[PDB]
Ligand binder design. Structure first.
Ligand SMILES: [Mg+2]
Lengths: 168, 71
């Protein structure tokens, strides 16, 4: 990615390759330029750092376009479903809990990594137990579409889990 | 006059109920509506579901009390 053309090229003797893969030899730059002009094409520096700098004859803009296509197409058809995190409290109640669970389910369906987090503030005694009781219960509820990857884990003032989708 | 029958039994906090009220599972037996004492209110004291607390119980309604002891 990211190359220079024709006249920007600073080397004298470039290893000259046709569009097919025809090795014309190591040529002086001017001749290569002339050839490019003749062809309706352009000379492109595809290996600037190598022994005799690697120059290929091609339609450069077209090539760039192709690269952009292949990139954006492939990249974003392979783009990650990130992490979706969900916050809770220890004292949590019913409707809200259910809503959260639903959200989690949705995320799983979509394909997204679930960080399941409980914030705490202080008096860390009944804290871990209740956190477990909640988070574990949630996990159990999702045991059809979801699997635990990370166990109930402390973070300082925080308790976290990571759930992965059952079939991705 | 004061009826001296103000019972002083202990209990595990069970539930966060609204407005400084708490289901508190007694060590003696059942859970009762147990509101926070005025003293406690005065000195802050955020009670959490999962503490040892002592409840002041009426013998007329032993399913309703008042936390006297923080922690
Ligand atoms: Mg009384």
């Amino acid at each position: 990615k990211e190359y220079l053309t024709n006249e920007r090229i600073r080397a004298k003797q470039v290893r000259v390759v046709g569009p097919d893969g025809k090795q014309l030899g190591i040529m002086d730059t001017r001749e290569a330029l002339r050839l490019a002009q003749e062809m309706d094409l352009d000379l492109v520096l595809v290996g600037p750092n190598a022994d005799p700098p690697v120059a290929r004859i091609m339609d450069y803009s077209k090539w760039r376009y192709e690269q952009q296509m292949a990139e954006k197409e492939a990249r974003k058809k392979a783009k990650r479903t990130e992490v979706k995190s969900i916050k809770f409290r220890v004292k949590i109640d019913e409707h809200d809990y259910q809503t959260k669970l639903g959200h989690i389910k949705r995320f799983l369906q979509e394909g997204h990594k679930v960080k399941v987090t409980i914030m705490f503030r202080g008096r860390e005694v009944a804290h871990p137990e209740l956190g477990e009781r909640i988070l574990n219960r949630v996990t159990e509820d999702l045991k059809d579409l979801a699997v635990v990857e990370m166990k109930p884990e402390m973070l300082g003032r925080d308790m976290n889990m990571l759930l992965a989708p059952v079939k991705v | 006059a004061k009826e001296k029958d103000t019972i002083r039994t202990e209990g595990v906090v069970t539930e966060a109920l609204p407005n400084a009220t708490f289901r508190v599972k007694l060590d003696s037996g059942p859970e009762i509506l147990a509101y926070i004492s005025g003293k406690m209110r005065m000195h802050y004291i955020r009670i959490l579901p999962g503490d040892r607390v002592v409840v002041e119980i009426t013998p007329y309604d032993p399913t309703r009390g008042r936390i006297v002891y923080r922690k």
